[PDB]
Write an enzyme that holds these catalytic residues in place. Structure first.
Site, PDB file in Angstrom:
ATOM      1  N   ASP A 379      11.865   7.757 -13.417  1.00  0.00           N
ATOM      2  CA  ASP A 379      12.591   8.785 -14.186  1.00  0.00           C
ATOM      3  C   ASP A 379      12.637  10.101 -13.374  1.00  0.00           C
ATOM      4  O   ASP A 379      11.686  10.376 -12.599  1.00  0.00           O
ATOM      5  CB  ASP A 379      11.913   9.034 -15.551  1.00  0.00           C
ATOM      6  CG  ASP A 379      12.564  10.211 -16.247  1.00  0.00           C
ATOM      7  OD1 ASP A 379      13.736  10.029 -16.763  1.00  0.00           O
ATOM      8  OD2 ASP A 379      12.005  11.317 -16.329  1.00  0.00           O
ATOM      9  N   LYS A 380      13.699  10.886 -13.523  1.00  0.00           N
ATOM     10  CA  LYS A 380      13.852  12.100 -12.730  1.00  0.00           C
ATOM     11  C   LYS A 380      13.109  13.289 -13.333  1.00  0.00           C
ATOM     12  O   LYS A 380      12.001  13.617 -12.910  1.00  0.00           O
ATOM     13  CB  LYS A 380      15.332  12.445 -12.565  1.00  0.00           C
ATOM     14  CG  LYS A 380      15.598  13.538 -11.546  1.00  0.00           C
ATOM     15  CD  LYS A 380      17.084  13.786 -11.377  1.00  0.00           C
ATOM     16  CE  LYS A 380      17.732  14.146 -12.700  1.00  0.00           C
ATOM     17  NZ  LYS A 380      17.161  15.395 -13.274  1.00  0.00           N
ATOM     18  N   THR A 381      13.728  13.932 -14.320  1.00  0.00           N
ATOM     19  CA  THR A 381      13.172  15.148 -14.902  1.00  0.00           C
ATOM     20  C   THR A 381      11.884  14.836 -15.655  1.00  0.00           C
ATOM     21  O   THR A 381      11.903  14.132 -16.669  1.00  0.00           O
ATOM     22  CB  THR A 381      14.189  15.800 -15.836  1.00  0.00           C
ATOM     23  OG1 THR A 381      15.395  16.073 -15.115  1.00  0.00           O
ATOM     24  CG2 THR A 381      13.636  17.099 -16.398  1.00  0.00           C
ATOM     25  N   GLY A 655      18.813  10.712 -17.747  1.00  0.00           N
ATOM     26  CA  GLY A 655      19.887  11.111 -18.635  1.00  0.00           C
ATOM     27  C   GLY A 655      20.490  12.447 -18.256  1.00  0.00           C
ATOM     28  O   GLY A 655      21.021  13.162 -19.110  1.00  0.00           O
ATOM     29  N   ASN A 776      12.079  10.325 -24.377  1.00  0.00           N
ATOM     30  CA  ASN A 776      13.407   9.782 -24.128  1.00  0.00           C
ATOM     31  C   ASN A 776      13.377   8.459 -23.375  1.00  0.00           C
ATOM     32  O   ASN A 776      14.403   7.773 -23.320  1.00  0.00           O
ATOM     33  CB  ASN A 776      14.256  10.791 -23.349  1.00  0.00           C
ATOM     34  CG  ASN A 776      14.000  10.740 -21.858  1.00  0.00           C
ATOM     35  OD1 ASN A 776      14.785  10.167 -21.102  1.00  0.00           O
ATOM     36  ND2 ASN A 776      12.897  11.338 -21.425  1.00  0.00           N
ATOM     37  N   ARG A1038     -17.893 -30.291   3.661  1.00  0.00           N
ATOM     38  CA  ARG A1038     -16.455 -30.345   3.896  1.00  0.00           C
ATOM     39  C   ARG A1038     -15.819 -28.965   3.786  1.00  0.00           C
ATOM     40  O   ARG A1038     -14.901 -28.639   4.546  1.00  0.00           O
ATOM     41  CB  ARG A1038     -15.799 -31.313   2.910  1.00  0.00           C
ATOM     42  CG  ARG A1038     -14.315 -31.535   3.150  1.00  0.00           C
ATOM     43  CD  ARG A1038     -14.049 -31.989   4.575  1.00  0.00           C
ATOM     44  NE  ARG A1038     -14.825 -33.174   4.926  1.00  0.00           N
ATOM     45  CZ  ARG A1038     -14.871 -33.704   6.144  1.00  0.00           C
ATOM     46  NH1 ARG A1038     -14.184 -33.153   7.136  1.00  0.00           N
ATOM     47  NH2 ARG A1038     -15.605 -34.784   6.372  1.00  0.00           N
ATOM     48  N   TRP A1042     -14.008 -26.597   6.831  1.00  0.00           N
ATOM     49  CA  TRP A1042     -12.610 -26.243   6.622  1.00  0.00           C
ATOM     50  C   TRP A1042     -12.417 -24.737   6.540  1.00  0.00           C
ATOM     51  O   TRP A1042     -11.390 -24.223   6.994  1.00  0.00           O
ATOM     52  CB  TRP A1042     -12.072 -26.910   5.357  1.00  0.00           C
ATOM     53  CG  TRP A1042     -10.702 -26.435   4.988  1.00  0.00           C
ATOM     54  CD1 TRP A1042     -10.354 -25.709   3.887  1.00  0.00           C
ATOM     55  CD2 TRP A1042      -9.493 -26.643   5.729  1.00  0.00           C
ATOM     56  NE1 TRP A1042      -9.004 -25.455   3.893  1.00  0.00           N
ATOM     57  CE2 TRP A1042      -8.453 -26.018   5.014  1.00  0.00           C
ATOM     58  CE3 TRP A1042      -9.189 -27.298   6.926  1.00  0.00           C
ATOM     59  CZ2 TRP A1042      -7.131 -26.031   5.455  1.00  0.00           C
ATOM     60  CZ3 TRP A1042      -7.878 -27.309   7.363  1.00  0.00           C
ATOM     61  CH2 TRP A1042      -6.865 -26.679   6.629  1.00  0.00           C
TER      62      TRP A1042
END
Ligand SMILES: CCCCC/C=C\C/C=C\C/C=C/C/C=C\CCCC(=O)O[C@H](COC(=O)CCCCCCCCCCCCCCCCC)COP(=O)(O)O[C@@H]1[C@H](O)[C@@H](O)[C@H](OP(=O)(O)O)[C@@H](O)[C@H]1O
Ligand SMILES: CCCCCCCCCCCCCCCCCC(=O)OC[C@@H](COP(=O)(O)OC[C@@H](N)C(=O)O)OC(=O)CCCCCCCCCCCCCCC
Ligand SMILES: *[C@@H]1O[C@H](CO)[C@@H](O[C@@H]2O[C@H](CO)[C@@H](O[C@@H]3O[C@H](CO)[C@@H](O)[C@H](O[C@@H]4O[C@H](CO)[C@@H](O)[C@H](O)[C@@H]4O)[C@@H]3O)[C@H](O)[C@H]2NC(C)=O)[C@H](O)[C@H]1NC(C)=O
Ligand SMILES: Nc1ncnc2c1ncn2[C@@H]1O[C@H](COP(=O)(O)OP(=O)(O)OP(=O)(O)O)[C@@H](O)[C@H]1O
Ligand SMILES: *[C@@H]1O[C@H](CO)[C@@H](O[C@@H]2O[C@H](CO)[C@@H](O)[C@H](O)[C@H]2NC(C)=O)[C@H](O)[C@H]1NC(C)=O
Ligand SMILES: [Mg+2]
Lengths: 1066, 350
Positions: A379-381, A655, A776, A1038, A1042
């Site tokens: 999200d920006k703001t 938004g 929001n 074994r 391995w």
């Protein structure tokens, strides 16, 4: 229709409207049982245990107690319920901090504002709100301490913005100043139903005189904040979950983890294995009882039909082999996921110092899926930016002036025209003396930076000057002009007084006219007189509209300013060009008339006000341009780069406007000055359809290479996404989004933020992450697999309904790389080790049916086998799934590509699950074969010819199977700390001490009286001690070879990193 | 208010003293070499220890259909299994004797040409007898074998097929103590032809905890009845003298101990602190347990107790098998270190 009375608390209660409470809790006191049963019984093991408990109720077929499985299912259910109750109590305690804030209410029986809590406001109560106070509920404004009635509301939580929203009150309904004279409010209001469609309101208030219409221009919603005001009077219309914003938000849903969905598919295979074993045992028993019926007359069988015996044998071997699915697993996994979620929220690298809010994990069920994230929906703001605008650089006469010169360009190059950077002290020294060629231009620019605006000044009690602007860029310009030397002080109609730092002399400008700002003009113009008798007009705006407003005839300072604007916009700076003009009064004698005639038309004022100003632009004198930067949070570009390097596709959903979201991306390096921006701004469905079709056609005509894709971005508009999200032909948008490096959506509604996530998660197989701030982007948080919220700054609703609450965006770099790759590796092996450790013991019961006529006689007893996963093999899983780390924390932040190891199923799957079950069959078979050979006919004791019986042999099997699983836990452990030396080698010493004491005091108390003298026939012998060295080594030879082979000759990507940490050589 | 800051302890911040183990080539090969050089001598010692045991298994089954009554007849080769330090000269022989009534007997004549100096033990080997059946292991009243006189409705349900017969209590109920091996072995090896007798005993042959938990019964002699399969030796029910106490009946205690496999030994006789001289010996066994009850074999085993009990190479072979896996992979991993150079590192495919 929704009817609401104005001033009564007796009639409005008959409608049953909701209160002003919020509930971010998962469970309620009326829905805990069904939701908890649907969450717990959604797995395939709880249903298995429930069906098993229903089999023991059949008579005769239950050899042991009838309450052995249901009593344990009840215990696991109580444990899960206690965990969920603790989490819900914490959630409710966090929620309680909101419903207790102060909120004044007008009482009719008191005629005075009373301070209450945020939970007592009902529909139709007069609320008085102060400055910088969150709005309690959807209040229609009725009065304010401003002329006519004005107020600024910041909606940074309604939807990401930066500018203050203007709100006013209606006429004849705004003179209600002071607490008194609020008793003549009679009538009713009719409004529409609560809907999430913002920016829309229709209705009328039926006052005692006539009706007054309504509009979204006087409708303040919950989440906004008053700014630059004193107090407002509001009438509540909607409240609680009926708010237009907090409407689609629901309770915390049941979020399943990709690990649980893989476990569910792993339990199915165990069911087929169990069915095969039961069928084999039943067929063997039936054949043995039918064919060899005359050689088993000493057992005194009942003798019935084969159909009546097969069912009984099936039901018996059901409970006899029901222990292949461990019950202690789905309890240990809960405690591991609860403990590793508490350790994450206690790290100092994820704790904010200047706020004192550490990270919390209010959902400990999805802590292990943090290392499998492929998409991040940011999200920006509020989440990326700090909501602070500041004057960074300036351009005058083709020269850049900057406070602190960076190291990218430093000095100038002076190619053709001067291009570079110079400090502000040069500007000061050139403005001081008037002997420079740019002194008057700089002077006029400085007067422009502190006059042509709409900023309201206010002197505080301490003496500090505060500025109030509906636009933050204008306030930043005013602050820049002030701290540069031209401090704007007082304003009043036809009067602007600005204090000059030099000589300490204040000025006085007669402000004549000023044109408002519009989305079509995109200019701010102001024409006035200077204290000398001349008229000057200033105009500032974007370089798109003002370029066609001036002509070139003498000012050859255009190309330099264009280069300067191109260099500024290539970094994410909001630029504005400025122009001055000096005009005489001969043209003003008619200009005053042509301007003031706009106040005479009483039909269309918005049509004349814009055209009245479009008649004074002949040739503007361009002064330069400004740069207003929006500061990002601490460590935002580095975090974005590190997350993009680890293979995560970062998206952005805000938004806000498109122009504001475009330059936000060039500053945090999300975009670049060379990538192709696939801008899609269409107004109809056919337009965006053809745009998407031509985009896919242009992208498919090329064969692609290492380039092309890393320089592709996708910018989407709000209404264009709404047309690209319809179910009819929507894959055209998804097929192109997976080819761009970054996606940025602008002007998106709070519902579309969740729609995008739900579309991505339903048409793919990747794990999403939704980080946001404010109310929001709450639904989006409730739409992704992991919802992370920001806590501390403005807005906390996104951090109360989320899953993890951080303080900064940079912490996401360590929550995913370090605390995500570990939890995915810890919870994996800790599960795979249990399914193995429960197989290496209870499989001998299936290898033993070939030696007891397929009767199902257990090798050990009930009490000894019941202590296996409870006392001696319970701590290794906890020490593996909590306090283990395959690589150090300093190396997970150095090589982000290692995160891809958790991005794909490399540590937990069904194919790997078979590798631990087959390995469990091998060890159990080895133990059984070795034990049935050493103890031939029981003649394996050198103690006066006595022999070893059934119970003296079962102790050897139970002891050998304990050293093997602990050896495997030791070979798996990568750390070996102080908590491991008490869980793997301490659990072995526990059994060797617990057995002699238990088998010597408990058989005397009539409790497990089969171990009456086995301690002499096991501890007192030399054969019992010679087997515990040759069998656990022969069974673990074994894996030890391995492991070395895989680490040496076929090293993986993490095997080299582990070796790099040991020898400390890069 | 509260600082809400997490503590700076080494535990909360996840920073503790670790080890970081890496299977370096100079750590696995020496480990394998050490494991092999340790497991080889113990393997050889456990292998040679099982060769010092001399035993003689004589499957005396099918005596009533393959042995002559007139004189002794040779036993087929598929019934004798002898392991001595020396070598026998005359093959084992057997005869069937029919005395009074129908109590037949098998007389087995064998040779001991070794002069055994270890303690001698005599067991019987039962084959294909599922004593570990789910309805057979737990099938006896623990309080009733404890000496307490339990009532009628107070007996435990393990004795489910046989328990009460015409409102009469059975003293040894359950599947066990009903199918007891009732072949009486001779308590003395009758020496013949210039050889002396070899006295044997059947005392202290059961566990020390069985002789302490098997108390003398306190039941009423007129309130209990013998099991169905105990009627040939206890007719007309129990009397005053017909009351077998389980305290001194050590064969009952050694049979009550349920075995783990269908092929099991059961101790009957033993002789310690005395050597077994060479020569011919004869053993008389009363035939009472028919092999048709379980469809197996009844053997007579004369063994000497060794370090692990009898000839059993299953323990010494494993110690030699692990070494066989340490001198193999520990060698093919050394030839890959000198004949195939391995890269140091810094080849991360990130
Ligand atoms: C007739 C004469 C025969 C002579 C035979 C002589 C020689 C045979 C040679 C080899 C024997 C078999 C070899 C098997 C072949 C290859 C082994 C592949 C091993 C393998 O990577 O996957 C394993 C399958 O789990 C078995 O290990 C599978 C074990 C299967 C072995 C036995 C297969 C048959 C089992 C049937 C039993 C049924 C018996 C029934 C009999 C009943 C009679 C009454 C499971 O992963 P794993 O725990 O090792 O983990 C590995 C690795 O160990 C580890 O270092 C890595 O990193 P880290 O370190 O960070 O974790 C980790 O990422 C991962 O790569
Ligand atoms: C030195 C310090 C060492 C500290 C170590 C602390 C370790 C404990 C530390 C306990 C930490 C526990 C954490 C979670 C681990 C798993 C627990 C769990 O899963 O709990 C379910 C159930 C297990 O049932 P199931 O095994 O899955 O199914 C039975 C089936 N196989 C059958 O045949 O019956 O448990 C119960 O129902 C509660 C009652 C247990 C009664 C037995 C204990 C008697 C105590 C008394 C027993 C006698 C004790 C005598 C002591 C001398
Ligand atoms: C050594 O051990 C042998 C096997 O354990 C045992 O041989 C069994 O002995 C029992 C006891 O006599 C036999 O059981 C009887 O079988 C006959 C049928 O052949 C039944 O009729 C009889 O029940 C009778 O019931 C009548 C009323 O209906 C009544 O007259 C009596 O109550 C009577 O009990 C018995 O159930 C069994 O067949 C024998 N063979 C097998 C294979 O079990 C030896 O006797 C035993 N010898 C010694 C010296 O201990
Ligand atoms: N003080 C100012 N005076 C004049 N113009 C300004 C001022 N501050 C910023 N601007 C310019 O105003 C322009 C705004 O364009 P806007 O952002 O209004 O288009 P929109 O994004 O289409 O609006 P919406 O999308 O919100 O309906 C920006 O290009 C910016 O440079
Ligand atoms: C040791 O063995 C000898 C040889 O069998 C036992 O002597 C026999 O005793 C019984 C019991 O009265 C007689 O019926 C035999 O005639 C005796 N045989 C001989 C050759 O004398 C002797 O009893 C055994 N010792 C013990 C303590 O039981
Ligand atoms: Mg936000």
């Amino acid at each position: 229709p929704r009817v609401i009375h104005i001033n009564d608390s007796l009639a409005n209660s008959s409608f049953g409207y909701s209160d002003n409470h919020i509930s971010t809790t998962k469970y309620n006191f009326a829905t805990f049982l069904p939701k908890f049963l649907f969450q717990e019984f959604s797995k395939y093991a709880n249903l298995f245990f429930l069906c098993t408990s229903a089999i023991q109720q059949v008579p005769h077929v239950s050899p042991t107690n009838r309450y052995t499985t249901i009593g344990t299912l009840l215990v696991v259910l109580i444990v899960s319920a206690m965990k969920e109750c603790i989490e819900d109590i914490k959630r409710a305690n966090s929620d309680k901090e909101l419903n207790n804030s102060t909120a004044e209410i007008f009482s009719e029986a008191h005629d005075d504002f009373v301070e209450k809590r945020w939970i007592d406001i009902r529909v139709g109560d007069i609320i008085r709100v102060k400055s910088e106070e969150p709005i309690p509920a959807d209040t229609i404004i009725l009065s304010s301490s401003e002329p006519e009635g004005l107020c600024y509301i910041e909606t940074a939580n309604l939807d990401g913005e930066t500018n203050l929203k203007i709100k006013q009150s209606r006429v004849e309904t705004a003179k209600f100043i002071d607490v008194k004279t609020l008793k003549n409010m009679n009538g009713k209001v009719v409004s529409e139903q609560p809907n999430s469609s913002l920016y829309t309101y229709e209705g009328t208030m039926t006052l005692n005189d006539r009706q007054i219409p309504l509009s979204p221009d006087q409708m303040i919603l919950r989440g906004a904040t008053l700014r630059n005001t004193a107090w407002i009077f509001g009438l509540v219309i909607f409240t609680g979950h009926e708010t237009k914003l907090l409407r689609n938000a629901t309770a915390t849903p049941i979020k399943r983890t990709a690990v649980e969905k893989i476990i569910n598919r792993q339990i199915i295979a165990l069911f087929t294995v169990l069915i095969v074993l039961i069928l084999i045992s039943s067929i063997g028993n039936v054949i043995m009882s039918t064919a060899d019926a005359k050689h088993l007359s000493y057992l005194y069988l009942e003798g019935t039909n084969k159909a009546g015996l097969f069912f009984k044998d099936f039901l018996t071997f059901w409970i006899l082999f029901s222990n292949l699915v461990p019950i202690s697993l789905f309890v240990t996994v809960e405690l591991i996921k609860y403990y590793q979620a508490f350790m994450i929220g206690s790290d100092l690298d994820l704790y904010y110092e200047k706020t004192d809010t550490p990270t919390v994990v209010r959902t400990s069920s999805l802590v292990e899926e943090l290392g499998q994230i492929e998409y991040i929906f940011s999200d920006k703001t509020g989440t990326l930016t700090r909501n602070i605008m500041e004057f960074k650089s300036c351009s005058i006469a083709g020269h850049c002036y900057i406070d602190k010169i960076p190291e990218d360009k430093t000095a100038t190059v002076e190619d053709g025209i001067e291009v570079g950077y110079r400090k502000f002290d040069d500007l000061k020294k050139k403005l001081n003396d008037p002997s420079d060629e740019d002194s008057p231009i700089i002077n006029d620019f400085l007067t422009l930076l502190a006059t042509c605006h709409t900023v309201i000044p206010e002197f505080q009690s301490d003496g500090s000057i505060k500025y109030q602007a509906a636009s933050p860029d204008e306030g930043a310009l005013v602050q820049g002009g002030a701290d540069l030397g031209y401090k704007f002080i007082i304003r009043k109609p036809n009067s602007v007084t600005v204090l000059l730092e030099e000589t300490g002399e204040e000025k006085e400008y007669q402000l004549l006219n000023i044109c408002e700002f519009n989305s079509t003009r995109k200019r701010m113009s102001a024409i006035f007189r200077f204290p000398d008798g001349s008229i000057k007009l200033f105009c500032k705006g974007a370089d798109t509209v003002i370029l066609e407003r001036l002509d070139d005839e003498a000012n050859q300072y255009v190309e330099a300013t264009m280069r300067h604007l191109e260099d500024y916009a290539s970094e994410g700076l909001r630029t504005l060009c400025l122009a001055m003009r000096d005009i005489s009064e001969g043209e003003y004698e008619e200009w005053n008339s042509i301007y003031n005639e706009a106040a005479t038309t009483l039909d269309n004022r918005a049509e004349k006000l814009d055209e009245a100003a479009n008649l004074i632009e002949k040739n503007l004198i361009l002064i330069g341009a400004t740069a207003i930067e929006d500061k990002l949070q601490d460590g935002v570009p580095e975090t974005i780069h590190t997350l993009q390097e680890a293979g995560i596709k970062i998206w952005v959903l805000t938004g806000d406007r498109q122009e504001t979201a475009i330059n936000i991306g060039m500053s945090c390096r999300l975009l670049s000055e060379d990538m192709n921006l696939l801008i899609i701004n269409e107004e109809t469905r056919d337009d965006t359809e053809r745009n998407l079709l031509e985009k896919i056609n242009a992208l498919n005509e090329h064969q692609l290479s290492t380039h092309d894709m890393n320089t592709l971005a996708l910018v989407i508009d709000g209404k264009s996404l709404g047309f690209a999200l319809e179910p009819e032909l929507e894959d055209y948008l998804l097929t192109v989004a997976k080819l761009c490096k970054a996606v940025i959506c602008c002007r998106v509604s709070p519902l579309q933020k969740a729609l995008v996530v739900k579309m991505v998660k339903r048409k793919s197989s990747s794990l999403l992450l939704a980080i946001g701030d404010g109310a929001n982007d709450v639904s989006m948080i409730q739409a992704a697999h992991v919802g992370v919220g920001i806590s501390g700054m403005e807005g906390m609703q996104a951090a109360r309904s989320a899953d993890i609450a951080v303080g900064q965006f940079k912490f996401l770099k360590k929550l995913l790389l370090v605390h995500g790759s570990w939890s995915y590796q810890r919870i994996s092996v800790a599960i795979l080790y249990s399914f193995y450790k429960n197989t290496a013991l209870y499989m001998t019961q299936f290898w033993y049916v070939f030696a007891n006529a397929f009767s199902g006689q257990s090798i050990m007893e009930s009490w000894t086998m019941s202590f296996y996963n409870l006392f001696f093999t319970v701590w290794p899983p906890f020490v593996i799934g909590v306090f283990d780390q395959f690589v150090s924390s300093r190396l997970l932040e150095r090589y982000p590509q290692l995160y891809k190891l958790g991005q794909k199923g490399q540590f937990f799957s069904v194919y790997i699950f078979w590798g631990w079950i087959i390995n469990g069959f091998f060890h159990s078979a080895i133990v059984f074969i070795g034990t049935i050979l050493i103890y031939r006919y029981g003649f394996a004791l050198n103690m006066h010819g006595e022999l070893a019986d059934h119970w003296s042999w079962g102790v050897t099997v139970y002891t050998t199977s304990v050293i093997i699983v602990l050896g495997k836990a030791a070979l798996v452990t990568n750390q070996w700390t102080k908590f491991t030396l008490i869980a793997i080698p301490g659990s072995l010493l526990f059994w060797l001490i617990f057995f002699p004491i238990y088998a010597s005091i408990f058989p005397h108390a009539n409790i497990s009286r089969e171990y009456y003298g086995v301690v002499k026939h096991t501890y007192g012998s030399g054969v019992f001690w010679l087997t515990l060295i040759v069998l656990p080594i022969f069974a673990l030879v074994r894996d030890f070879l391995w492991k070395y082979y895989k680490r040496m000759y076929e090293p993986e990507t993490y095997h080299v990193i582990q070796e790099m940490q040991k020898y400390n050589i890069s | 208010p509260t600082s809400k800051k997490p503590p700076n302890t080494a535990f909360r911040q996840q920073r503790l003293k670790a080890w970081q183990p890496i299977l370096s080539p100079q750590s696995v090969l020496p480990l394998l070499i050490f494991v092999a050089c340790i497991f080889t001598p113990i393997g050889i010692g456990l292998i040679v220890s099982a060769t010092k045991v001399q035993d003689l298994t004589i499957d005396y089954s099918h005596c009533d259909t393959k042995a002559s009554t007139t004189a002794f007849e040779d036993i087929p080769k598929k019934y004798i299994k002898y392991h001595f330090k020396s070598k026998v000269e005359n093959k084992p022989q057997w005869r069937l004797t029919e005395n009074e009534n129908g109590e037949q007997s098998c007389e087995l004549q064998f040779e001991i040409p070794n002069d055994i100096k270890k303690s001698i033990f005599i067991y019987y080997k039962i084959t294909n007898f599922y004593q570990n059946h789910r309805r057979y292991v737990q099938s006896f009243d623990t309080k009733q074998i404890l000496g307490e006189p339990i009532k009628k409705d107070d007996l435990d349900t393990s004795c489910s097929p046989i328990r009460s017969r015409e409102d009469k209590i059975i003293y040894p109920c359950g599947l066990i103590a009903n199918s007891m091996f009732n072949d009486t072995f001779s308590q003395v090896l009758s020496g013949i032809d210039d050889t002396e007798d070899y006295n044997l005993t059947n005392k202290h042959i059961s566990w020390s905890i069985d002789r302490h938990r098997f108390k003398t019964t306190k039941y009423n002699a007129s309130d209990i009845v013998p099991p169905p399969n105990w009627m040939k030796k206890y007719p007309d029910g129990y009397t005053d003298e017909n009351l077998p106490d389980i305290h001194t009946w050590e064969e009952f205690q050694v049979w009550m101990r349920t075995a783990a496999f269908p092929k099991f030994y059961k101790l009957t006789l033993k002789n310690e602190s005395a050597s077994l001289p060479k020569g011919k010996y004869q053993m008389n066994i009363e035939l009472n347990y028919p092999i048709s009850l379980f469809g197996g074999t009844k053997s007579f085993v004369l063994t000497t107790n060794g370090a692990i009990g009898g000839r059993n190479m299953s323990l010494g072979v494993l110690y030699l098998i692990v070494a066989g896996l340490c001198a193999l992979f520990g060698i093919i991993f050394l030839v890959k270190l000198i004949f195939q150079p391995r890269a140091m590192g810094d080849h991360t495919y990130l």
